[PDB]
Every structure is written in C-alpha cells, then in structure tokens.
Amino acid sequence: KYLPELMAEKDSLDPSFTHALRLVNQEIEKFKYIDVVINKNMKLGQKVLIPVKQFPKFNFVGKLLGPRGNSLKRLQEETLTKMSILGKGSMRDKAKEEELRKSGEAKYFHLNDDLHVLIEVFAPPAEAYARMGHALEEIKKFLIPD
Amino acid sequence: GAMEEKYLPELMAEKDSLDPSFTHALRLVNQEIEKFQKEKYIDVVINKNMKLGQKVLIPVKQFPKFNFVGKLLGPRGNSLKRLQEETLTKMSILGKGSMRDKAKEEELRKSGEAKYFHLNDDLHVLIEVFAPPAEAYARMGHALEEIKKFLI
RNA sequence: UAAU
RNA sequence: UAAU
C-alpha cells in the first residue's frame, strides 16, 4: 500500500522539487561484528577535511591530483586505498559544479558537503585498519602546505 | 558547513512550497530537515584525539565450549591487562557468556535496564582506541592482529 | 583462568 | 596539476 503512494508522488511531483524527489526515490529504493577467524574483507571509510577555510587560496586539489591525476593514482596504489576528492570546490569549474549540485542526482549530492577526501579500504580487519592509518599519514603531506 | 549555507535553505524552501497533499514527500523533507538540525570528518591540521571502536566476535558457535573468556582474562585478569597495555587499547568482554555466573546474568538486563543491554547481543570483545587519527587506526589494526592469538 |  |  505504501510503495504505490510513493510512486504516485514520484510521478506527480513537479521536477523543481529536486530534494523532495531525491528523498522520495531514496525511500522507494529501500524496497555487524568482526569475526577474526575467517578474516573476511571489511569496508572502512574515513573523510578527511581539506583545510580550505584556514588556507583559502592554496590549491589543495591541484596538489592532490597532480598531472593527469597521476599523483593521486600513485598515492592510491602505494597505500592500497581508494581516495575520492568530494564536496564543495572539488570540481575544476565552480559554475559547472553548482549546476550539477542543483540537479539533485544522488551522484552529485556530495557537492552540498564540505571539501574532503574520502579514503576507503577493503581488506581483512587488521590490514584494513593498518592501511587506513598509513593513508592518513601520507595524506598529511598534501593537505598541510609547507 | 556548505550544508547549512545552501542545502538547508533549499530544503526549507521546498517544505514551504510543497502542496501538502504530498504527505510522504512533505514528511520526508521534514524528517531530513530535522536530521540536519540535530563522528565523521578528520581535521588533519589540528590532528586531535579521535575515538575508534571495533567489536570482535568471540566465535562461540564454531567452538562451542572452548573457554575463550578464561583464556582472554587469565589469572586475576592479568593476560587481558597485558594485551591492552601492549596495544594501547581498552578491551571489554561483553555479550552473553560474559559474566562468570550464568544464573543471575539473565536477570541483570531484565527490569533494571540501564547499562546492561549488551547482554542481549552475542559474546564479543569491544576494542576502543583514543589517539590522533593515523595512530588510532594503526593501533586498532595492531590490536586486531594481537587479539587473534586468543580467539583460536 | 573472571578483568575494567 | 583535475583523477574516480
């Protein structure tokens, strides 16, 4: 009974209610402890603020990515993590970025957030926490100007 | 944060202009406004102490009466004290099976019911670390390696 | 093996 | 410096 009401609203809501539509679709689409013997891969995620407020003119994203992205790819490979630069100011063109933000797609919803690096690890527990610790130490050398 | 600068006003403007016959969308917009108006992001310039906790299952079902709790603690609890000190964690044995006497162990999360609902969950070890971020993850990984030696 |  |  409840999902058919949600779908009627999805279909009848005016497009300009981008946030309501997102919350409705999200609600529609909705239709543990670590066991150390079998030691299965677990997901760890951690967001790290880029200190833009305190360094408003430093080019953190450009330093993080490098030419053609190669600096961030090499840092990903040598830390065995995935790193995503997300949040306000994470794109090159701020006017383009703002239009994507306004589109309401979940793919661009992170643009409402503060500029951060999302570090994600998938590994057995002891190794996942170790990897994340090493990634945090290396990522400092990029986020703190010198 | 950029949420309080543009997301929240936007939510607010939608809630004010939504036709209230959309009772689900209006409900969900209102709940989302509520969620935002009431921990996750590392500030790596300040690098302040951060909390990390991880619960580690004691594998009672595969090993139904190997005495894990006894091996973890040792005499007067010294072996668990060693392990916390060497890893720089706090470690708490919790779940069902945690207390020495099974009889009362049932009654304590009947009635009273303030601090003891960890006795509705499986038996497990809670590992807690408090340290700057890179060190805190490093410490948890080390405590996870060290503690395997007690769960096999 | 019974700790905080 | 613009990756995913």
Numbering used by the authors:
A (entry chain A): 4 to 34, 44 to 158
B (entry chain B): -1 to 36, 43 to 156
What does the paper say about this structure?
T-STAR is a tissue-specific STAR protein mainly expressed in the testis and brain3426, and regulates the alternative splicing of CD44, Tra2β, Tau, VGEF and Neurexin pre-mRNAs262728. STAR proteins are defined by the presence of a highly conserved RNA-binding domain, the STAR domain, also responsible for homodimerization, and composed of a central KH (K homology) domain flanked by two highly conserved regions, QUA1 and QUA2. Here, we have determined the X-ray structures of the T-STAR KH domain in its free state, and in complex with AAAUAA; KH-QUA2 in complex with AAUAAU; QUA1-KH in complex with UAAU; and the full STAR domain in complex with AUUAAA. Taken together, our data reveal a unique mode of RNA recognition and dimerization by the STAR proteins Sam68 and T-STAR that is crucial for their function in alternative splicing.
The structures of the T-STAR QUA1-KH and STAR domains in complex with RNA show that the QUA1 and the KH domains form compact dimers, with each KH domain binding one RNA molecule, while the QUA2 domain does not adopt a fixed orientation. The QUA1 domain adopts a helix-turn-helix motif involved in homodimerization, and its fold is very similar to the structure of isolated Sam68 QUA1 reported previously (backbone root mean square deviation (RMSD) of 0.61 Å). No electron density could be observed for the N-terminal half of the linker connecting the QUA1 to the KH domain (residues 35–42), suggesting that this region is disordered, while the C-terminal half of the linker (residues 43–53) is well defined in the structures. Surprisingly, the KH domain and the C-terminal half of the QUA1-KH linker of T-STAR provide an additional dimerization interface. This novel KH/linker interface covers 1,065 Å2 per monomer, almost twice as large as the QUA1 dimerization interface, and involves mainly the C-terminal α-helix 3 of the KH domain and the C-terminal half of the QUA1-KH linker. The KH interface is stabilized by a network of hydrophobic interactions involving residues A138, Y141, M144, G145 and L148, and an intermolecular hydrogen bond between Y141 in α-helix 3 and Q58 in β-strand 1 of the KH. The C-terminal half of the QUA1-KH linker (residues 43–53) also contributes to the dimer interface with the side chain of Y45 and the backbone of I46, forming a network of hydrogen bonds with the side chain of D125 and the backbone atoms of K59 and L61. Accordingly, the structure of T-STAR STAR in complex with AUUAAA overlay very well with the structure of T-STAR QUA1-KH in complex with UAAU with a backbone RMSD of 0.9 Å for the QUA1-KH atoms. The crystal structures of T-STAR QUA1-KH and STAR domains show that the QUA1 dimer contacts only one KH domain. From our NMR and SAXS data in solution, we conclude that the contacts between the QUA1 dimer and one KH domain observed in our X-ray structures are most probably due to crystal packing.
